[PDB]
Design a protein around this ligand. Structure first.
Ligand code: ZN
Ligand code: ZN
Ligand code: ZN
Ligand code: ZN
Lengths: 220, 219, 219, 215
């Protein structure tokens, strides 16, 4: 196809540019053989993680799925987590959502989109979980609220995995973070849940949800 | 933690000098509401896809797992594919592997690393399926060869999903790509499997495997 | 070893008897090639589905997992459901729970048993969701109640699968059921959720959860 | 619908009979609280595991899926295994296949049946893995052989799980078995792969494949 030919062109261009440039990108990268952060984000990948964190190359270990979820029984995501924690020994796992999310929108949409709806049924359970609250908001607000709540709930799911617990239990150093950035700002905004142990996981989660429930006058 | 606070730091800075620079980044990015490419890469994420393709912001839909796999029964990945195809109408799906891959290395190591070992057993099955070839290969060369064969097999697995076959069948335009890049130079190299229908999938797959099976004395 | 040798011996004795008895069992089984009911039960398999229903051999298509769950993204169970519905054209899917379930007890337990805990986290989310009702209940009675609620919630998950809904949408005849039996008497008791359309799914689910919430002065 | 009513009618009849006719079935069942075997069979469930083994009620922990598979990354099946092994301390896991399996037939058919096709792609990979042997057969006889080979492979997958290997590594007693029965007679036939350690898994698997390849 045309787009592919061009894509390959853009790559060859950049690739050779470096080569002759005697750049050190491929040298720096090779010196950071091991990441120090696990990044769990959405497949929409609006603003890249490398852009948002300005970290050095090779510093991130990433996983992306629709609506950045951590489902209790998802072998795929759980495997990325376990490998990150038990093998790479990385000490920080970040879950990052984002406003105006297709996953979130699809979840709320009353339409059958095929296989994906099943995956999104987890989001809808989260929706009905905070129904009363979300119902107190204004229509144009519900979307971004769910996005924020979602991230809270995923961090909570992540902290309840046998993987994270056993890590904490053996005294291994590991912290869980859950932020959300706006596609227009690019500023990472902590959502409240940040665990370094199961106790801190429980506390921050309870608070994070309590705070989210305090609605500004903006919402009906 | 020191690393976290520092990360939040690098961000507020970058995002600030973007607002007080009237940059149109978040403006242009907003113009690309729907991606046109689905990128399935490795969690290692050595060289970002954004840097490899140098594409326009917001044009890539992305999924990443250990050793960029498309497991027949992986609900996570298949959901990404189905959403991209049936809902976003994306017409290009790329599977990208890379040299010096941890997943690949972990798969070849005998050590039981835990849960991740079950996930990597799919890679080990690929290894055995190409045991003759890989055996004839030199020790410090195998990893990179398996890395390339893995990409070929994943495009093959992707083209066999009911999601993709049904897409083609009902008359939807869609192509599958499988590339690999050396972490030392960042050059995207086609592994041979490219499909626009189930028929082209079969042909290019047989040819790709055939070619990959030709070993130079450089092993 | 012992247990295994005995089992094999039991099998031999049985099959011989059948052959010498000139039994018609197998020929009758062969008569029922396609099942008419999909039974989703617990791996505990306290009282076999065959004994509980006295159905003719081969009339049941079966799936069992810990705590008879229908998780939204479980490829195994959904594969069974889609095959039974889209291929076998089964019109009745029955989820069946039982009292004194090890999966339920483990879910409510506090010990981290390893991999299985993750699977059971779905049951714990159901435990918290109904925490008010359960807490307002007698401790020694909570397990039985969670077992009943679990079933109603699983039927609700089943009825929400893209698989079951599409079948109803295209006018295919299909009803869902959720029952529980006490391991002490074997009587199947309907839990209230019973659907033949998503309309009946919502209504019966609401009514079921409401009904279960009306406690008698005995906790 | 009538079918269901009849089903409920039967349950009551049987259960009622059990009570007044005073039966100790449930009492005996209650006695066998913990299972001693994990049975992984097909959802086709032609001849019930209870009828094939004629075991005491409550002795079996059961998992069933289409074509009795043990897929490396299936959270459902691995959870049953880990629970059975690490929690119930079961020492025997049995994978049982059967002739005339709808799962095997659908995997061989070149029809697109939907989601189930993705599940069966693992069977097709197995078919290709033994394409030399299987290709020397007619479609009919190929099904019976693939049925037997599938079981040998599943046992192999089970023995390669981190769950099973760890159990063996800490010295827990655990054996794996792969059998098949003809739906016309019900005789359980050992397919050859029997493991009590990783080494015996490798050897018996290789040996079993070797025997199965003799026509
Ligand atoms: Zn998103
Ligand atoms: Zn990699
Ligand atoms: Zn149970
Ligand atoms: Zn079968």
């Amino acid at each position: 196809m045309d787009k592919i030919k061009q894509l390959f062109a853009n790559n060859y261009s950049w690739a050779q540019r470096m080569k002759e440039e005697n750049s050190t990108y491929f040298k720096e990268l090779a010196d950071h053989q091991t990441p120090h952060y696990l990044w769990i984000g959405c497949s929409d990948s609006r603003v890249p993680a490398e852009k948002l964190t300005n970290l050095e190359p090779g510093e991130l270990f990433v996983h992306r799925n629709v609506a950045n979820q951590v489902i209790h029984t998802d072998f795929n995501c759980l495997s990325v987590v376990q490998y990150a924690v038990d093998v790479l020994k990385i000490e920080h796992i970040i879950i990052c959502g984002h406003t105006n999310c297709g996953g979130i929108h699809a979840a709320m949409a009353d339409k059958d989109l095929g296989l994906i709806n099943n995956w999104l049924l987890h989001i809808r359970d989260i929706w009905f979980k905070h129904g009363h609250l979300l119902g107190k908001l204004s229509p144009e607000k519900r979307a971004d609220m769910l996005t924020k709540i979602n991230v809270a709930e995923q961090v909570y799911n992540l902290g309840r995995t046998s993987i994270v617990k056993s890590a904490w239990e053996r005294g291994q150093k590991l912290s869980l973070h859950g932020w959300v950035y706006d596609v227009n700002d690019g500023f990472l905004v902590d959502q409240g849940v940040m665990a370094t142990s199961r106790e801190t996981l429980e506390i921050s989660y309870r608070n994070a949800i309590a705070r989210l429930s305090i609605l500004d006058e903006e919402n009906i």
